[PDB]
């Protein structure tokens, strides 16, 4: 019944914190801040452009989010600076177990469903050495919407020929788990932050900035349907497909 | 030309930080964290439920966002605790110059356009003694969307009989400013946080949690059209209108 495993890209297969060395150059001493706000604003702008009916591809969203973030620090970077710096998003490091996971999943059909513009995804996947791990790398761009709009998830059937019930959708992002579940896929959430660790981290004197972002982005969202499955890592997927309901 | 002044409610006419006593009661020592994450998640859930096509009114959104927020701390509140604590959002205090601004705006049409569910807005407006200050208190609920969806702003002409070009929309929220501008209204943004202050606050030693929320929510959003006018407080609106554009 599961004929295909479809993966979210940013934050699920690829580490969005991996732009850290490059952002710590835009503002020495503020790389950590920049990395978090940039990701947060990229997500917010994807949602707000889509809800307004004013789509622009993820490359433009990524650059607009970066401009906002650097603007908070008092900077006014020009477009050429922004485009150069935003290339960091096309070189994100894959999670260490992604390649082993994707190889052990075959012979299932393997794919990505991402907000990324087509060129961004091509570079990201190839730079990570994973182009031969996917049957299809689907961008939402043809639909002019962003996850979790249902039309973004509709592309899976269009491109792959499989129905929602035959797809295992994989994401570490709570909003994306909710959209996929809403659309009708079976969902495996990748939870890298134990709830109990976050609770204690929040209760320990200092509430650092990094903790704030973890609290906003690494949990299941309350409005959302629960994922069918939750694993701590991508490497557990193949075994999950083997014996789990 | 301007015939009606339409205001966003939460964050604009009413202070969302005024839930501080209720939150400090929910978790002594974590009141400020809860306030901020609750507001952020309320906004995210409004956008994500709308974008998914799975609307729930703002009373459900507010409680869902509160459950999430208390859950990050390791709590598991039952529904009655959530409904009870969420009433703090129906008791928000108006900004100190709101009463005076509204009084000076008659006899122009005065209205609210908010995400708030009809019961919520009724009780919030009554509590602040401002019921006779508005010609209409419009909830997005009949359209079953949330701002900045275009159908939310379409309600203004439906209810008031004035066209977009005859409306001055007032918000302190960058996404709502963008939504209203996209829709065709003239927009006056209320900017309570000088940009230069934020830039220095952020470069000043360790970044406090409260600063993170300011950085995410108090500026103009980069994907949005710029507002027509920017004022530091609601009290400046009357004078802005007599000498406006």
Please tell me which residue of chain A has the smallest CA distance to B52: A149
Contact A58, A49 (CB under 8 A): no
Listed residue (A118, A111, A209) closest to A169, CA to CA: A111
Task: Report d(CA A19, CA A37) in Å as an integer.
Answer: 12
Residue whose tokens read 């704030």: A212
* Maximum separation of any 2 CA atoms in chain A, in Å: 53
Q: Which CATH number fits domain A1-15+91-241: 3.40.190.10, 3.90.1150.10, 3.40.50.1000, 3.40.50.2000?
A: 3.40.50.1000
> Of the candidates A33, A48, A219, which has its C-beta nearest B178's C-beta?
A48
Contact A74 B49 (CB under 8 A): no
Residue holding tokens 């959002």? B89
Q: What is the DSSP letter of B1?
A: -
Q: What is the CA radius of gyration of chain B?
A: 18
Give the other-Cβ count within 10 Å of B107's Cβ: 6
In whole angstroms, what is the distance from residue A198 CA to residue B226 CA? 38
**Strands across the sheet containing A167-171:** A136-139, A109-114, A4-7, A167-171, A186-190, A229-231
Which chain A residues are closer than 8 Å to B54 by Cβ?
182, 223
Query: Which of B53, B148, B207 has its CB closest to that of A33?
Result: B207
Using CA atoms, how far residue A171 sits from A13, A174, B98, in Å, is 8, 8, 44
Contacts of A199 in chain B (CB under 8 A): 72-74
Cβ atoms of B238 and B100 within 8 Å: the answer is no
Contact B202 A47 (CB under 8 A): no
For the CA atoms of A138, A143, A147, A150, the dihedral, rounded to the nearest 10 degrees, stands at: -110
From the list A56, A60, A227, A74, the residue with the least C-alpha distance to B200 is: A74
> B215 and A61 in contact by Cβ < 8 A?
no
Q: In degrees, to the nearest 5, what angle opens at C-alpha A94 toward C-alphas A90 and A95? A: 150
How far apart CA B133 and CA B158 sit, in angstroms, is 20
In this complex, do A148 and B52 lie within 8 Å of one another by their Cβ atoms? yes
Start-to-end CA span in chain A (Å): 11
Report which of B14, B221, B51, B33 is spatially closest to residue B145, judged by C-alpha positions.
Answer: B51
Can you spell out the DSSP letters for B93-140?
PBPTTHHHHHHHHTTSEEEEEESS-HHHHHHHHHHTT-GGG-SEEEEG
Structure-block tokens of residue A37: 């706000």
Quote the tokens at residue A31.
């790389």
Q: Is A201 on the interface with B (CB under 8 A)?
A: no
Q: What angle do CA B56, B216, B65 make, to 5 degrees?
A: 25
User: Dihedral through CA A201, CA A205, CA A209, CA A214, nearest 10?
Assistant: 20
User: In angstroms, rounded to a whole number, what is the distance separating the alpha carbons of residues A179 and A191?
Assistant: 17
The whole-angstrom distance between A193's CA and the closest CA on chain B is: 11
Chain A contact for B226 (CB, 8 A cutoff): no
With CB atoms and an 8 Å threshold, state whether A215 touches B37: yes
Backbone angles phi, psi at A194, to 5 degrees: -60, 135
β-pairing verdict for A186-190 and A109-114:
unpaired
Which letter does DSSP use for residue A108 in this model? S
* Calpha distance A154→B19 (Å, rounded): 41
> In the structure encoding, which two tokens stand for residue B175, read together?
């996404």
Contact: A52, B207; criterion CB under 8 Å:
no
The nearest CA of chain B is from the CA of A34 a distance in Å of: 11
- Residue B95 buriedness (CB in 10 A; 0-12 / 13-18 / 19+): buried
Of A44, A53, A198, the CB nearest to B72: A198
Nearest to A191 by CA among A179, A202, A177: A177
Alpha carbons within 13 A on the beta-carbon side of B61? 26
* Inter-residue contact A180 to A169 (CB < 8 Å): yes
Within 8 A of A203 by CB-CB distance, chain B residues are 30, 73-74
Q: Which helix (H) or strand (E) element contains residue A50? A: helix A31-52
Task: Please give the structure tokens belonging to residue A145.
Answer: 């919407």
Rounded to the nearest 5 percent, the helix, strand and coil shares of chain A are 55, 10, 30
A 134-173 → B contacts, CB under 8 A: 146, 148-150
B51:A149 CB<8 A = yes
Does B9 show up as a binding residue in the annotation?
yes
Prior bond of B217 cis (ω within 30°): no
* Distances A119 to A24, A43, A106, A172 between C-alpha atoms, Å: 25, 19, 25, 23
Q: After which residues is chain B broken (C to N over 2.5 A)?
A: none
Task: Tell me the shortest Cα–Cα distance from B184 to chain A, in angstroms.
Answer: 12
Please give the Cα distance from A197 to B194 (Å, whole number): 36
CATH number among 1.20.810.10, 1.25.10.10, 1.10.150.240, 3.10.20.30, domain A16-90: 1.10.150.240
Q: Domain coordinates of chain B in residue numbers?
A: 1-15+91-241, 16-90
Residue A97 annotated in active site: no
CB B182 within 8 A of CB A54: yes
Determined by which method? X-ray
- C-beta of residue B121 within 8 angstroms of C-beta of residue B114: yes
Helices (H), chain B: 20-26, 31-52, 58-72, 79-86, 98-105, 118-127, 150-160, 174-183, 195-203, 209-217, 237-241
Contacts of B204 by beta carbon, 8 Å cutoff, 6+ apart: none
CB pairs under 8 A between A and B: 139
Q: What is d(CA B37, CA A216) in angstroms, rounded to the nearest whole number? A: 7
B225 DSSP 8-state letter? P
CA A232 to chain centre: 16
- What's the Rg (C-alpha) of chain A? 18
A13, A234 contact by CB (below 8 A): yes
Contact check, Cβ <8 Å, A37/B216: yes
Mutate to test the interface with A, among B26, B33, B44, B149 (most CBs of A within 10 A): B44
Sign (positive/negative) of CA torsion B32, B36, B39, B41? negative
d(CA B15, CA B89): 10
Cα maximum dimension of chain B: 53
């Amino acid at each position: 019944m599961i004929k295909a495993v479809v993966f979210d890209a940013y934050g699920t297969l690829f580490d969005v914190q991996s732009v850290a060395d490059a952002t710590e150059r835009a503002y020495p001493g503020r790389g950590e801040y920049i990395t978090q706000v940039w990701r947060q604003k990229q997500l917010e702008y994807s949602w707000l452009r889509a809800l307004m009916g004013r789509y622009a591809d993820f490359w433009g969203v990524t650059r607009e989010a970066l401009a906002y973030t650097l603007g908070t620090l008092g900077l006014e970077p020009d477009e050429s600076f922004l485009a150069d710096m935003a290339q960091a998003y096309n070189r994100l490091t894959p999670y260490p177990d992604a390649a082993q996971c994707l190889a052990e999943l075959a012979p299932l059909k393997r794919a990505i469903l991402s907000n990324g513009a087509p060129d961004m995804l091509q570079a990201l996947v190839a730079n990570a050495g994973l182009t031969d791990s996917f049957d299809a790398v689907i961008s939402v761009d043809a639909k002019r919407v962003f996850k979790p709009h249902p039309d973004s998830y509709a592309l899976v059937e269009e491109v792959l020929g499989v129905t929602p019930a035959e797809v295992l959708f994989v994401s570490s992002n709570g909003f994306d788990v909710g959209g996929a579940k809403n659309f009708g896929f079976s969902v495996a959430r990748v939870a890298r932050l134990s709830q109990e660790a976050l609770a204690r981290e929040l209760v320990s004197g200092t509430i650092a900035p990094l903790t704030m972002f973890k609290a906003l982005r690494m949990r299941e969202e309350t409005y959302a349907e629960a994922p069918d499955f939750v694993v701590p890592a991508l490497g557990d997927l193949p075994r999950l497909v083997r014996g789990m309901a």
